[PDB]
C-alpha cells in the first residue's frame with residue numbers, strides 16, 4: 001500500500017549527485033537513482049528542493065516522504081529515521097587552494113576558516129573536533145555558498161563529500177585553482193556507511209519497496225550503466 005505519489009526531498013547543491021541545470025531541472029546520479037526506483041515501484045514521484053538541514057525535519061513532519069541527497073547512513077541518524085540499503089559510498093575530504101599547506105589536522109587548521117554544510121556529517125565532525133579546539137568552522141545553508149566563499153577567499157578550506165568536491169567542483173570551471181588538501185577523512189562514528197534513501201521509521205512498506213527497486217536496478221546492470229555517466233570508478237564501494 002504505497003502512496004500514489006512519493007515526495008522526495010533533495011539538496012540540489014551537490015553535483016554530480018543532485019544539482020540543477022541551467023533551466024532549473026534536477027540532474028545527477030541521485031536523481032537518476034530516485035527516478036529509476038520510482039519507475040520500478042510503479043509510483044509517481046515529486047522532487048522537492050530543500051536546504052540540506054531542512055530535509056530530516058521535513059521528513060519527520062511528513063512534508064516529504066523520502067530523502068535522496070547523498071544522505072549518509074549514520075548511527076546518529078538511525079536514531080531518528082530509517083534508511084534504504086546503500087545507494088553508494090561517500091567519504092569526506094578537505095579542499096583548499098592549490099599549493100596550500102593545509103591538512104585535515106587541528107595543528108594545520110587552528111584559526112583558519114573552514115566551511116561545512118549545515119546539518120551534514122562534515123559539520124558534526126568539524127564542530128566536535130575542530131570548532132571546539134579553535135578552528136573557525138563556518139556552517140552554510142548550501143554548498144554553492146561554500147564554494148563561492150572559498151573562491152572569494154573568505155574561506156581557507158572546505159570539508160564535504162570527496163566525490164562531490166572532485167566531480168562537481170575541482171573538475172569544473174569554478175574549482176581549477178583548488179585541490180584536495182590531505183587524504184580523505186574516514187571516521188566510522190561521524191561519516192556512516194555510505195548513503196541511502198532517508199525514510200520515516202514507521203514507513204516499513206515504503207522502505208521495502210525502495211529496497212526491492214534498488215536491488216532490481218543493481219541486478220540488471222542499470223546501476224552500473226547510470227553510474228558510468230558520471231564516474232570512472234566503483235562509486236558503490238563494498
Ligand SMILES: N[C@@H](Cc1c[nH]c[nH+]1)C(=O)O
Pocket residue numbers: 011014052069070071072090117119120121122160161195
Ligand atoms: N553525505 C554527507 C554530506 C552531504 C549530503 N548531501 C550534501 N552533502 C551527509 O549526509 O551529511
